[PDB]
Amino acid sequence: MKIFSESHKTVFVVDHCPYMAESCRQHVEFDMLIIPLAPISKSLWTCSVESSMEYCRIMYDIFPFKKLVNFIVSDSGAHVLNSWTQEDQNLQELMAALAAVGPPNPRADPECCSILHGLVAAVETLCKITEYQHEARTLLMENAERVGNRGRIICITNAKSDSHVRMLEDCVQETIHEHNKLAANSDHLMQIQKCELVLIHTYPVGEDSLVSDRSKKELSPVLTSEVHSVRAGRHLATKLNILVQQHFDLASTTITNIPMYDVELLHHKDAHVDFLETITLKWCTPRTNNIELHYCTGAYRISPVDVNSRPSSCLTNFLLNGRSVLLEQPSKVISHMLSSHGGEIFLHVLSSSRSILEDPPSISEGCGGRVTDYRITDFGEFMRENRLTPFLDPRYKIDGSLEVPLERAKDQLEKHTRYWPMIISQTTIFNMQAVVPLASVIVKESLTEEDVLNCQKTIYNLVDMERKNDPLPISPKRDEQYRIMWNELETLVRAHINNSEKHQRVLECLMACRSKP
Amino acid sequence: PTVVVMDVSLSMTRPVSIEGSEEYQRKHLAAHGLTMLFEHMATNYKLEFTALVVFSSLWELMVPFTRDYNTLQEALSNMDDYDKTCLESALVGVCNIVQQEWGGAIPCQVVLVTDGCLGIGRGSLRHSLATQNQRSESNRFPLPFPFPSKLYIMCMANLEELQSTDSLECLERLIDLNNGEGQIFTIDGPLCLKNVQSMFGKLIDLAYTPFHAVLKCGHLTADVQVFPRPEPFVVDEEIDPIPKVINTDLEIVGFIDIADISSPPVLSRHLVLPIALNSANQIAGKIPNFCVLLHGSLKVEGMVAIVQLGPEWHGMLYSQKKKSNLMMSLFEPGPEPLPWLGKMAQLGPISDAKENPYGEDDNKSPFPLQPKNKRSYAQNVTVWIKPSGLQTDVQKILRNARKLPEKTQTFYKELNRLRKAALAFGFLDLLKGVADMLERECTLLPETAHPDAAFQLTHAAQQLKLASTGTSEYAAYDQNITPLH
Amino acid sequence: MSDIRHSLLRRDALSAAKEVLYHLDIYFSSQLQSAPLPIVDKGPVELLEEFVNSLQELQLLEIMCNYFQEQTKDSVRQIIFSSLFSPQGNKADDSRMSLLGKLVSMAVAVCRIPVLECAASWLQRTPVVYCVRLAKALVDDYCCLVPGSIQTLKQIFSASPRFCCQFITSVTALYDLSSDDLIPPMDLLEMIVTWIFEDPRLILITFLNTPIAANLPIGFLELTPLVGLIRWCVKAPLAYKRKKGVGMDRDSHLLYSKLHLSVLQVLMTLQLHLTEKNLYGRLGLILFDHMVPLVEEINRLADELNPLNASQEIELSLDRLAQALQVAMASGALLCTRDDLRTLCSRLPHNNLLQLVISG
Amino acid sequence: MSAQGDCEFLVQRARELVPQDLWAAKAWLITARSLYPADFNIQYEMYTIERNAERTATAGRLLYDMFVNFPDQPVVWREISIITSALRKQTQFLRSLFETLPGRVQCEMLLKVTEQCFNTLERSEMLLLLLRRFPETVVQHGVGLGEALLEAETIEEQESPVNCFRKLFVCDVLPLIINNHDVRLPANLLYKYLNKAAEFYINYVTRIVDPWERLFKILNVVGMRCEWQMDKGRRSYGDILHRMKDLCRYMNNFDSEAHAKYKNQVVYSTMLVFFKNAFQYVNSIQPSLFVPLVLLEDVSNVYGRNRHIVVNKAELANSTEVLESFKLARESWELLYSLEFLDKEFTRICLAWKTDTWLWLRIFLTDMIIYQGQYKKAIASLHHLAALQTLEHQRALIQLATCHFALGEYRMTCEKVLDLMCYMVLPIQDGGKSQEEPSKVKPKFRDLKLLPCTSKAIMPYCLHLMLACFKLRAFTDNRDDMALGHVIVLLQQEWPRGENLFLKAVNKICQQGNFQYENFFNYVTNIDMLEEFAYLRTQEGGKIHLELLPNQGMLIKHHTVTRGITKGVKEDFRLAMERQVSRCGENLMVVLHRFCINEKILLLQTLT
């Protein structure tokens, strides 16, 4: 929905008790190429943390902005690994914080602490305001009430029984009620409107499921209990993949037929509206420069699910090389086209259906279409002379006035267009090759001294040409064409006179040097 | 795309007792009124596609989408008299033809011609609305059109009083299932032809007036007709619910290279046709226009032109079958509609730049802008979901250890990355294991016996052995196992 | 009584007469106190004759009436009335009659009740020869000298009905209509008729209030005026024929018929009264000896009046007499047999009603 | 010579003198009386003479003497009758003449001339006058006058018994009788006065200040005579009903010798309260007999002691008061006939003077019967009402229709309905468009109604009867003949309602596919009905016959099979609808009435 949706704020809490430290009974076979070592089983906490990290990676790639994530390990103490600022919502910072936390202690104090501390820290964290929420509240003065701060908290732990699950549910209900009550009086703390809770429970494979799965259950109009349960290892990874796919309204893609295996891409769901559980768009032959401008109705970022795999790496490297890739929906019809705009893989959504703007009227029959002397090349030069570029440094115009470069471009276009004849036959000064220095210099906002000497040389050359009675372009006597030429130059210069004093200078120099009868 | 759904049911054959003139059937009133609508179309909305499906017990498409309004005009006078009313089937068929022809994103106004006689039951409007609302069961109610439509109902059921006796709440609710995008039109008066003419004039003024605009590029200007009219847009429903519409003037704000622009995500592709304010070619044809010059220059040079349609809105004015014209787009209203162009409110002319960013030879280009934070597929992330990836990493680190000391730096970098990832994931026993494989490869050293190679692998193995303890000796993430000199 | 007479010889006539009247009042009261039945000696009569101009006479009458009003004892007033103003058979009776007439007229003028009652009592104890003269004087004074004076005598009806009855007795016994000059005046006849019609019992008050213990003396006034009124009614047509004004004759005839009807009603009331106090068939207020003179008078008039010319008047008179007799022995007022009635009516002219009454 | 000649001569001689000399004539008459005191002619003549002179005392004395001596002469009775007629300028003279007579003697003449009167009204008035002027005569002749009036008013047996006797009683006789408690009246004679008093009162109001409170005053006052009631004063007409109900709850128990006090009270008082409520209920309905309304029965959902009457307050504002007055009237009638001892007395008192079925009460007795739940006795009542007798006919047959319904007749019920509608055709304009569309008040699974008799009420009701009657006839077994055709046609009215029945019928049409309703397009002027029917013929419908053209069977049968007729058979079927839908707007009631009036042969199907 809006920017501050229910998925806008996501808080993760991870079990850190010594009970969450043993292996998950899923020993791996890293030894490929004598007698290899015993197979190594990754600990349940390690699997949960790494799968959570993958969830974070997918969410960051698909949504670089407007979506932050915290991380609260649940140990004897309550530690938050990153704040809500966009600058602190980084993958490497999370990795460094997790490394600093270290593996769970095996035999420190198993029964000293529980996960409830993480839950209360999370709900206490959830009531905070992000930077974007603060900006929204500031801009909506005296009306900063329609700002839904709904979030979502996900918990990973190994509960011994469903009774503990219910106890945690009641505890989180009570503590969020207390947090809402505390936020009612306070000003710099928004009251939670919708805090969805997920309580994934993990266990080593080969052990029974101590807790049965439960469906949605709203213990309050501010909570949603959706506690899932699954074995550790790859199952947890798939559960988290499904969670992220159904959290932010995602979709899957199974690009195939890549010359050298298939690859999987995750992106926003709206890219599949043309088709209307993974679509199987097929690679099509990439033409070098057939067409340049397509009709794209969407630009959705993507993130491969196996970024380090050989096929995904090859495809991403090829896209990042610069060339685009055209796909095809399964007689063929062109469809979604991949591209890499500076290092961000975009999955466009072309439009293959019949264009409602087909067979438009011929421009030769519309208004102004029966004239064949248009200054197309002159306007091409005009276009190329006002091309745009970004500016990372905001300068000050006069005094504390940080000018917007867009208004600068607008005023430059206005200055250029003060006297612009449209058709070739209309003008003669612009058609003359002598005035090109004037046509390129006088238009400037502030002519320099070199501009001054160039304009003086140009008017001197024009005077010499008049003295020699050279044949000017036809564009009706020689005196008549000379007179209309001086009229054109005088009209041009006086228009830009107010721009700078040098313009008035060249104006009165022309007035003195003109051969006015 | 306009689909004129005309009810041909027997209910429309009822004569109405008008005063003075002869008896006129409601079907014939409907006839004169659409004739008026199709005229205002062929005269002032010529580019607009339209279709006319007449619905009965079954719905049938007599005339598909076409710009030829003469065919539609004669189609009104060649109509049969099927005699059953069923709106749900008609709406389902309209969805079918719209999706089949255009798709799911193009707006498709629907003109509906009912008579306030929904039906007796079953296929009737009341029976469908009262039952299908509770459950779809793959029989989803077609009233919520899966595209930004606008349901206009020419309920020519005399005054609102006449249709309030039996059924008008059903119609007004039917409009609401379209999310309020529509309007009920009631002909007030004794069903006179002038009344229905005023009715259809109101419809024309509401929905089918051309969107005239002035295209001002600096100081040059021209009068254009942006076909089709632009739809209003809303940012969201929480912070800014007020819809926004483009300004009457389109100010060209610069130009950008068509290769740099890539293929931008637009809202809707709009034609721009000059409007004069064989006479057209003999008078308006010979006077120099600006749209012709702009389109020709854009085609020849091969660029586009950014446009400012208002505060925070921004579009594009590009050129182009063999036929070509000056079509205009609409970017997403916001600060950065194109994320690879920077904040679109931060684009300046090359004159204000220190040097010429585009280059003297027209080779350099600031576009596209690299995002401030790199993504994952471009960076070097470590993923250990499947055992295959971790096996690939360990195979890579083992193979490069054979090339030691040729690729010493790469092997050290990969080992440091693996150690950092293990420390982040707490995979200390994995670090001990990879130390064991490093020792094993040391035991299987080749007969070359490079002196510096053995020292590096032994030092690395010692580093992993000491770091696997979990103590502060190498717990630091900044530690990268510097190779021995 | 010589001392009283000697003392009065110096007092002026008016004063002395008053003083002797007062002395006689005192003496009469004393003798009434001593004895229930008083004796009127010749001494008071001699004194009153001896001592009891126009102005002097008027003053004497006024003071006498003032004393009569002042006196409260009725018996003494009646006794002195009899002592002074009763006839004595001497030459002073004419002066006594004149004085009594003027006194009664003067008292009637101002309606002095005791004088009227006393004069009513005296007429019952007086010979008719003086009652008729008193009636002459008073009727003349109140009917012929001063016109309009009949109204003055009319209000006496509400004062002394006994005096009215006595006046009717005297007038009826006087105006027997035996001569033209004896015809009663029209005004007097109308007044009498009106008085009798106002209340029939007016002519029976003397009969009722007088305790009948002995027969009335011969020559005295009758107990009731029924005889005189009957004579008037019967003789009326013959008298008016003999006298022969049409309107006055018609009025007189109507008044006489009304009087006859009133007399018949009075006779019926007298029958009731006689039955009540047990005189029915034993005492007759209309003495049978009085029929002979009336019958003879009717006969001589009938012979004289040429019945061929006065058949209607004679028939009316006979019918009136027959009706009066039929009521009289119907009411018991007349105590006579049918044979006696036949004997006295034999000489009368033939009449159907008279013959029916005679035959019964 | 006889004395009669002498008396005549004396009278004639006195008579001639009257215009000339009244005194002489009176003297002659007095002489004649003295000669012949036993002659009546003299006394009569002088009494007449005194009366002519307007002399009250003498004429009164002479009249008294002549009456005492000569009562047998008819002229004495004529003079007394004239004087008492004046008593009931010359009137003032005659009244003053009566005063001069002695009071006991005045009572003597009044009594004897009252006995001389033959007509009950005149005798009652004479005795009431005597009663009023002589309060001492209430004891002896107040009983006699009451008994005579009661018997001679009960013997009349008038269809509506009303004579100026009980009004006389309540105005004069009753108050002076009750206040003068010295009057001794037997308990039985007390009941006779109620027979008289009730008789006149019920009919006079059936045709003056306030008879109802007057007769209620009689009941309480006549009760106070010896032992009946001793209750309060201005009590309601409903409280005494329950009080009498509680009376018989004790009275219907043990009785030893007579129980006449309670048994007669529970009969007469209940009858009075039954009749008092009878007027109130009957007068409320069917007014203008001195718009009418008629009690009807349950039509309810045609598409779906403890009975309740449903009355819309719009047509009758005071329906609440009438409903309670009707309710306790039924109870009073029930108690009067539930008790066996009271029932025989109730029958006897009714047959004494109910006489005619009392058209107003004929409406009444027709009402509980239906409320009770029995109908055949009502049928006889309506038969009696019809024999006793525009709008008046309307009341009968629709009462027949509800009564002929009788839960399962369905043959005479419909027969009465379309017979009623022949007189129904007032509605050139019907009743507008929509006059306060039926309220959504849902009865708790319930009924009996009460409507006026002016088109807008009865017309929907009679059609509703036809809807249900044909509905049960055409929704079972098979042979979807004009049975189903009529009910679909009858379903045309109130279209938003019969959709379920219409949907049921078309489903049955699909199963059969042999809809033969030759006269179909003459009644179905409805767009939605025609629209649904054409839908069948297109895809897979039951190839509806719809022989909707006169003289089509003869054309098919009498013509040889030719191939140039199939096109016409298909085309005219569509052509008929196009003509039929062209009708569209019209008065549905007018069309529905037209369908019923022409299709009197519907009764052939209704026999099922």
UniProtKB/Swiss-Prot annotation, chain A:
Its domain comment says: The cleavage module binding motif (CMBM) mediates recruitment of transcription factors.
Where does this chain mainly localize? Answer: nucleus
- Family per UniProt? Belongs to the Integrator subunit 13 family.
Q: How does it assemble?
A: Component of the Integrator complex, composed of core subunits INTS1, INTS2, INTS3, INTS4, INTS5, INTS6, INTS7, INTS8, INTS9/RC74, INTS10, INTS11/CPSF3L, INTS12, INTS13, INTS14 and INTS15. The core complex associates with protein phosphatase 2A subunits PPP2CA and PPP2R1A, to form the Integrator-PP2A (INTAC) complex. INTS13 is part of the tail subcomplex, composed of INTS10, INTS13, INTS14 and INTS15. Interacts with transcription factors ZNF609 and ZNF655. Interacts with PAFAH1B1; this interaction may be required for proper recruitment of dynein complexes to the nuclear envelope at prophase.
What Gene Ontology biological process does one annotation of this record name?
A: mitotic spindle organization
* Cellular location(s): Nucleus; Cytoplasm
Q: Please explain the role this protein plays, according to its UniProt record.
A: Component of the integrator complex, a multiprotein complex that terminates RNA polymerase II (Pol II) transcription in the promoter-proximal region of genes.
Counting on the full-length protein, the chain here runs from 1 to 564 of 706
Q: Which domain of life, per UniProt?
A: Eukaryota
Q: In which tissues is it expressed?
A: Widely expressed. Tends to be up-regulated in seminomas compared to normal testis.
Keyword Ubl conjugation on entry: yes
This protein is called what? Integrator complex subunit 13
Gene (name only): INTS13
Name one cellular component (GO) term.
intracellular membrane-bounded organelle
**For this protein, what is any one GO molecular function term?**
DNA-binding transcription factor binding
Swiss-Prot record, chain B:
**Ligand binding (Mg(2+)):** S9, S11, T85
Q: Where is the VWFA domain?
A: 1-203
Signal peptide location in the record?
Answer: none
Q: What is its main location?
A: nucleus
Q: Does the keyword Metal-binding apply?
A: yes
List GO terms (cellular component aspect): INTAC complex; integrator complex; nucleoplasm; nucleus
What Gene3D superfamilies does the annotation carry?
von Willebrand factor, type A domain (3.40.50.410)
| Protein's GO biological process | regulation of transcription elongation by RNA polymerase II; RNA polymerase II transcription initiation surveillance; snRNA 3'-end processing; snRNA processing
Task: Tell me the compartments it is located in.
Answer: Nucleus
Q: Which cysteines are joined by disulfide bonds?
A: none
Q: Determine the domain of life of the protein's source.
A: Eukaryota
Q: List UniProt keywords, sorted A-Z.
A: Acetylation, Magnesium, Metal-binding, Nucleus
For this protein, the record's Pfam families field holds: IntS14_b-barrel (PF19435), IntS14_C (PF20504), VWA_2 (PF13519)
InterPro entries linked to this entry: INTS14, IntS14_b-barrel, IntS14_C, VWF_A, vWFA_dom_sf
Residues where N6-acetyllysine is found: K396
**Record's keyword annotation contains RNA-binding:** no
Q: In which tissues is it expressed?
A: Strongly expressed in numerous cancer cells compared with their non-cancerous counterparts (lung, prostate, colon, stomach and skin).
Report the function annotation for this chain: Component of the integrator complex, a multiprotein complex that terminates RNA polymerase II (Pol II) transcription in the promoter-proximal region of genes.
Say which family it is in: Belongs to the Integrator subunit 14 family.
Oligomer status and interactors: Component of the Integrator complex, composed of core subunits INTS1, INTS2, INTS3, INTS4, INTS5, INTS6, INTS7, INTS8, INTS9/RC74, INTS10, INTS11/CPSF3L, INTS12, INTS13, INTS14 and INTS15. The core complex associates with protein phosphatase 2A subunits PPP2CA and PPP2R1A, to form the Integrator-PP2A (INTAC) complex. INTS14 is part of the tail subcomplex, composed of INTS10, INTS13, INTS14 and INTS15.
Name of the molecule in the record? Integrator complex subunit 14
Curated annotation (Swiss-Prot), chain C:
Q: Which residues form the signal peptide?
A: none
One Pfam match, given by its short name, reads: INTS15
**Which InterPro entries does this UniProt record tie to the protein?**
INTS15 (IPR027844)
Output the superkingdom of the source species: Eukaryota
Instruction: Give a GO biological-process term.
Output: brain development
Q: What's the stated role of this polypeptide?
A: Component of the integrator complex, a multiprotein complex that terminates RNA polymerase II (Pol II) transcription in the promoter-proximal region of genes.
- Protein name according to UniProt: Integrator complex subunit 15
UniProt source species: Homo sapiens (Human)
Its lineage opens with:
Eukaryota, Metazoa, Chordata, Craniata, Vertebrata
Gene behind this chain? Answer: INTS15
UniProtKB/Swiss-Prot annotation, chain D:
InterPro entries noted in UniProt: Int_cplx_su10
Q: Where in the cell is it found?
A: Nucleus
Q: Name one Pfam family in it.
A: INT10
Provide the alphabetized UniProt keywords: Isopeptide bond, Nucleus, Phosphoprotein, Ubl conjugation
Taxonomically, the superkingdom here is Eukaryota
Crosslink feature (Glycyl lysine isopeptide (Lys-Gly) (interchain with G-Cter in SUMO2)) location: K377
GO biological processes: regulation of transcription elongation by RNA polymerase II; RNA polymerase II transcription initiation surveillance; snRNA processing
Its GO CC terms are: INTAC complex; integrator complex; nucleoplasm; nucleus
Name the family the entry cites. Answer: Belongs to the Integrator subunit 10 family.
What do we know about how this protein assembles, alone or with others? Component of the Integrator complex, composed of core subunits INTS1, INTS2, INTS3, INTS4, INTS5, INTS6, INTS7, INTS8, INTS9/RC74, INTS10, INTS11/CPSF3L, INTS12, INTS13, INTS14 and INTS15. The core complex associates with protein phosphatase 2A subunits PPP2CA and PPP2R1A, to form the Integrator-PP2A (INTAC) complex. INTS10 is part of the tail subcomplex, composed of INTS10, INTS13, INTS14 and INTS15.
The record describes the protein's role as:
Component of the integrator complex, a multiprotein complex that terminates RNA polymerase II (Pol II) transcription in the promoter-proximal region of genes.
Protein's name according to its UniProt entry = Integrator complex subunit 10
| Species of origin | Homo sapiens (Human)
